[PDB]
Design a binder for this molecule. Structure first.
Ligand code: PCF
Ligand code: PCF
Ligand code: PCF
Ligand code: PCF
Ligand code: PCF
Ligand code: PCF
Ligand code: PCF
Ligand code: PCF
Ligand code: K
Ligand code: K
Ligand code: K
Ligand code: K
Ligand code: ZN
Ligand code: ZN
Ligand code: ZN
Ligand code: ZN
Lengths: 393, 393, 393, 393
């Protein structure tokens, strides 16, 4: 009467029926009731109920019954404790904030990290290692993306844009070689795009796929040569700006990399820290721009009609630029303080920038480290054969 | 006789009566005395006293009785151990320094993180989400603060300050548009301020509130147009300097952010590390300024009458500026060593600066990380319903 | 029947025969079978099988039998748990990914960190502390390597390369003193190399040794003076480029240092993070170069025939250089944005560079820290005498 | 026979006599012998030996007996485990390298952190808080040290060194005010120094005290005015260089600070990491200086007689300066690559510098963090009254 002995995995836990009776609806509560002999495993020889569970954590569960606050035992992996409290009926959203960030850590990382010829057609878009043709087409598309990017970067150069005379417009024209190489790359990319269009299951998600969007936007300007006078000039002007995306085709290749998927998950999972960093920088930039603009006017020469003639800080927005360059410890040197007051404000800006940049960035860095370790583990670990054949219920 | 068996949560702990008798006044000490059968729960069948507590930590408490030094078991959350030793009577200020910083960690973070129409009137100052009018007034005050700040930053620009001729004073005058927008913003802010003044409970703390102080100081210069000749020029000169605070109205909006409250708590809780960083920087700056000023004179040309003509380091304070810019790895390039001795001193300055900046900043960064994790946890965790109905004493 | 009591190190673990029978082939499975009395140690008095093992981890092993997922107890060193599960028959490649990176940590670090006168001849190449002649030859080779390096660095100077007139070729010739010192150093190094050639066991690995390769490549140019007209000029031109390696002889001395061996192991063990860092930098550099080149053309003056006359960003590759200098927070200041659009892109470049540089570098830094702590431990720990005399099987 | 039951703190540990007999000379070994009933506490009723010790760690000690390798249980503070194994007789220098750096951590930090009127005379050198006169003399010496330093820094300025004509030597002379203030400060410091000389116990250590050395060296130049023609000019020239130490008197005041004592202990305890950092920087600087000097000559114009006319990298030592400025991400911009090859080498230099600077600096930073946390703990913790009255042996 009032003393009940729980036998968990061969370790006898003793407690009063009242302590079990505190938290109702849970399995131990039902144990405390007078109709428990039939309900649960029990032997009249020793008057102990037997549960075939880890005892080392049942200590902590029973502690939640005793004191009233549920904590995570720091000597067991989060998932192990999760499964134990799941069996005992304790709700997992009860743990104290002192032990919540380590408990809900692996599960946060885990959640963040998560007709006959049609297969052979689609095998050109599957993983490279999934076939030999796949690994060849992947190498070829890599070569052609690189050639496109190099053509772009060389097209913007001077050596390949000699000035010429047109009869009466004077301008610089691009070499023919570049246009020919661009045509070749467009032919290859359009062939690939048409072959991919051949098989397009769930065309809504195919259009929602950012990669295919980038491909089509990148292939639009060249194919607009036939389509393209007054509107034609504006559309060409925006067509150069569209061609600006042609470097974005490199993500098609780098998507199969692991570190980049981890980086995408890190970014999408650390929005709060990015917003925090941007707010810190905005406040710092504004405050220090105002401070330096006013400091640099103290020593202004009275003779000059303008308020500031000898200082780079002729207004506050210029202060914004200097404040960013100085807080990130970049320090180009295009504009710097030139008055003792300006120098004081500048030293404060450098130190405050180091601090308010080093506040949230370590949070973000720890997120990436955790996700990368987990992803590399899940990649390295050989595929299991589920050695444990579970017993029937 | 001399062998007493303590039954804690179904685990029998055995020890000599002397070990219990060492630390007097505590509950176990009273257990050791010969008048313990009535005082505590005890059965003559097994000669064991029964305590319904976590046994895994009673091991460590009894260890304090045995050896004489109290430690924190690194496998339980600090608050759990705190509550257990609180029950057993052990003083919490006895733990060894090896295990004090982790024990008193959550409790440090926790402490650092902590007439009919009058409600509807005050509802304009309450949280935005607390109503719909609140969220609208909040959006409107955001718009008007941003307009005030943009007017300020554009007022300091040249494009909006064209030079003019006044008849005989020559100066640049600000555009009328800016003055009109400023008047509009002042009208709105004064309306808000008067409505807030309508209801001001505990007016002493209302005046002590830094936000209301900033509001009044920011609204004083405009309203001084009517009040405002010899004293008037000085008060206008200081009025521009007062208007310098008008950018501080952005804290009124950003106070409801979480990262900023965490930053305020971090700053206020890491004063020692800030003083340490400032002392390190002062010693480094002084020492390296002297060293570089003397190094740069070794190669001074004898012909020149001045001691230093070819060096930027004409004196030591200039050295202060260079030493800050160089120790923070900023490196503007306005002044740099130009003598082999100067270059040696410069390399030492760069390395020593990296080191004495990276000494205390990680301490501060860890503080912010801990406070931010705890605050984000306490924000995310859904409000509890206190499932545990405590038993009557 | 169905209730089996395992006695591990004096702690009785109780469980059903089914739970043991789940995972077959393991020792506990064989325990569950009806032919277990003879097979294992067992007493009919208490009906318990006795195993003389750590019980605190047998809890977790039996937990793997019960639930079906094997975890690492965070309260025991990885090697201890490894040895226990090795005894019990559990495969070590079954642990959950939540507890794999800490389990397989020490073993990863450990694996990464791992005729009469012929002995006296070879004693000149052995460790310096291994003899007295060894420590003397080591000091002497240090002196001579340093003299060679100083001769090199001074040979490239102007003070030692005065212009002269040759009769009709005009050029600058190196001082004779440098050539004499070089000859002396070559004599010493060739004597050392010949003495080492005297004894060369496993000559294949001797040739595979990078140090001996560097020695021979460094000693080739001088000895080619006798060997060395049209081909002679090209071979001299490449001989200067070969002599460029003469600074690599410093690794011969620094190989006996500990931090450098740890750094070599860190590099070779963190290839993935290096590839990740290089990919991040390549994407960032490409993207930001394109963005800044296009941003800086928005404000281009229309009068100029060239597209860009007032900007340092005349093409995209120049953008590559600026993007590296700006993302590493180096910021020389040779080229910087000069247009409001350029300044926006520049601020984004600085922040994104800090982030994508601080992503993988902490992983690499943690690797080096772990390897260095382990190597310093293994160096400090005095050589053991294996106090534990193991019992015969 | 062969089965011995050890009762440690009420938990029965069972093991074979052979396992105890493995490690000889230790207490458990003596337990295993047949003459153990009299030697140790033992009851024939239960055939168990009773030890009044923590059982949770006796598990691990007995594990050392069983397997043969001693590990540290990660759930107990290092000192607790130290004291337990000290009682059991296990040598502490046996623990495995996997668990040595965490075991020997607190003890490393701890070791690193460690006639009638004569008392009133010496009370002027004792701690400021130790009296009222002490706190006053401390404030006064602070004021006078600051005045000396300000006089120094202003003496090197131009405003206070106007050029004058002496009749025939032309030079700039220092203002009289500075000399008068210097005389006053020297009078005060000499009075303090004489009063301290009054009482000088253990005069050998008084002379070995670096602070008194600095005081005497700083006070020597002024007092040499009376002592001080040909030798006089050289001694004055070195006297300015001696006066260079006058800024070192600030350590007299800052010695009572805590962060500085922690920094001194950190430096003295991290010599290996400093040597490692310096070696890394020397190799990096040498290698990259050579690489950039050779890279920048590829694009050298053939017309120029000199090898390099258009590059800042006219020789290799200049490369040393650039390599330091670039590896520390300082980047003054006085010299930077101007050739595509030079730019490649420069990008490599920036990245390699970040890496080989971030390798050992985190080790040093962790040392400082550990020492600072321990020192702040030992400072905060109130002085104990040793509640535990130990029992007589
Ligand atoms: C200026 C830079 C603009 C960046 C363009 C946006 C990045 C991008 O598009 O890359 C996404 C891929 C992931 O692509 P995916 O998720 O593996 O494949 C399907 C794509 N969906 C259908 C989800 C859209 O790859 C990534 O997630 C890597 C993130 C890039 C990190 C920067
Ligand atoms: C530290 C304590 C320093 C307090 C300084 C208070 C100065 C009060 C003097 C009032 C008027 C002084 C004056 O008229 O000028 C004297 C000099 C010259 O200053 P300037 O005439 O305005 O222009 C200097 C710029 N150059 C020459 C390079 C082009 O002035 C100077 O050159 C001194 C500039 C040095 C201040 C830079 C401090 C940077 C960090 C300080 C400590 C950081 C600790 C964290
Ligand atoms: C030059 C910059 C000068 C900074 C002005 C001082 C900062 C400030 O006033 O912001 C305070 C608010 C917190 O304000 P609050 O505590 O939530 O509301 C009541 C304010 N009392 C009554 C306590 C005064 O917000 C904060 O605490 C954020 C701290 C700002 C971090 C920089
Ligand atoms: C490392 C070991 C280096 C020790 C250097 C000892 C030099 C002793 C020579 C005494 C006199 C030499 C002399 O008269 O000048 C020779 C050159 C030129 O030096 P300068 O005439 O004074 O002016 C150079 C400045 N420019 C040309 C750029 C405008 O001198 C030079 O250009 C050499 C400057 C290179 C020193 C910079 C070292 C920076 C870091 C060193 C290692 C960092 C490791 C951490
Ligand atoms: C441009 C820099 C080019 C670097 C040259 C390559 C580094 C090198 O050769 O140093 C290697 C030595 C280790 O040499 P070791 O392994 O102790 O001795 C035998 C060498 N084997 C036979 C293995 C080849 O030392 C090291 O491992 C230190 C790695 C250097 C870190 C940079
Ligand atoms: C923040 C919000 C800022 C948004 C800026 C939007 C500008 C829209 C104005 C359109 C046209 C403005 C114009 O014609 O120029 C006005 C000025 C002058 O700009 P500029 O004529 O092109 O040349 C300036 C370069 N100097 C003078 C140094 C040689 O313009 C300027 O000087 C302003 C430059 C300031 C922008 C630098 C921002 C840097 C970081 C921003 C915040 C970082 C937060 C993280
Ligand atoms: C160029 C800089 C040259 C630095 C001078 C050397 C630093 C120094 O002298 O400060 C030492 C004091 C500690 O002094 P103390 O140990 O407390 O008192 C007695 C001094 N003994 C007898 C041990 C010599 O204070 C310190 O230990 C602080 C270390 C300074 C960190 C830089
Ligand atoms: C990445 C891949 C880049 C590979 C570059 C290979 C170049 C091979 C071309 C051989 C000959 C080219 C030539 O003659 O010059 C073409 C231009 C101009 O180069 P320059 O004539 O020698 O002088 C440029 C310096 N300015 C103009 C600023 C004064 O050349 C240039 O301006 C290009 C310089 C851009 C290289 C800087 C790369 C910086 C980091 C690269 C990636 C970092 C990733 C980590
Ligand atoms: K910089
Ligand atoms: K710069
Ligand atoms: K810089
Ligand atoms: K920097
Ligand atoms: Zn786990
Ligand atoms: Zn907790
Ligand atoms: Zn271990
Ligand atoms: Zn402890």
């Amino acid at each position: 009467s009032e003393r009940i002995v729980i036998n968990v995995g061969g370790t006898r836990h003793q407690t009063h029926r009242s302590t079990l009776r505190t938290l109702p609806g849970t399995r131990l509560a039902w144990l405390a009731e007078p109709d428990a002999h039939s309900h649960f495993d029990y032997d009249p020889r020793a008057d102990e109920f037997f549960f075939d569970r880890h005892p080392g954590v049942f200590a902590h569960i029973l502690n939640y019954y005793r004191t009233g606050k549920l904590h995570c035992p720091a000597d067991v992996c989060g998932p192990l404790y999760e499964e134990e409290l799941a069996f005992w009926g304790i709700d997992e959203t009860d743990v104290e904030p002192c032990c919540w960030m380590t408990y809900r850590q692996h599960r946060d990382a885990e959640e963040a990290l998560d007709r006959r010829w049609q297969p052979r057609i689609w095998a050109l878009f599957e993983d490279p290692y999934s076939s030999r043709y796949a690994r060849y087409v992947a190498f070829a598309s890599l070569f052609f993306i690189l050639v496109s990017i190099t053509t772009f970067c060389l097209e913007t150069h001077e050596r390949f844009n000699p000035i010429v005379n047109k009869t009466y417009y004077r301008e610089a024209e691009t070499e023919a070689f570049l246009t020919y190489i661009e045509g070749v790359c467009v032919v290859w990319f359009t062939f690939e795009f048409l072959m991919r269009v051949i098989f397009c299951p769930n065309k809504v998600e195919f259009i929602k796929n950012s990669l295919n969007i980038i491909d089509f936007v990148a292939i639009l300007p060249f194919y607009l040569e036939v389509g393209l006078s007054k509107a034609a000039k504006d559309v060409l002007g925006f067509l150069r700006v569209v061609r600006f995306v042609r470097i974005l085709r490199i993500f098609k290749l780098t998507r199969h990399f692991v570190g980049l998927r981890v980086l995408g998950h890190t970014l999408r999972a650390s929005t709060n820290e990015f917003l925090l960093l941007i707010i810190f920088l905005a406040l710092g930039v504004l405050i220090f721009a105002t401070m330096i603009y006013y400091a640099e006017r103290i020593g202004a020469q009275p003779n000059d009609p303008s308020a500031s003639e000898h200082t780079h800080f002729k207004n506050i927005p210029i202060g914004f630029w200097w404040a960013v360059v100085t807080m990130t410890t970049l320090g180009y040197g295009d504009m710097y303080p030139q008055t003792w007051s300006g120098m004081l404000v500048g030293a404060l800006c450098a130190l405050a920038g180091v601090l308010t940049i080093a506040m949230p960035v370590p949070v973000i860095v720890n997120n990436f480290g955790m996700y990368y370790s987990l992803a590399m583990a899940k990649q390295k670990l050989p595929k299991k054969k589920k050695k444990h054949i579970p017993r029937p219920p």
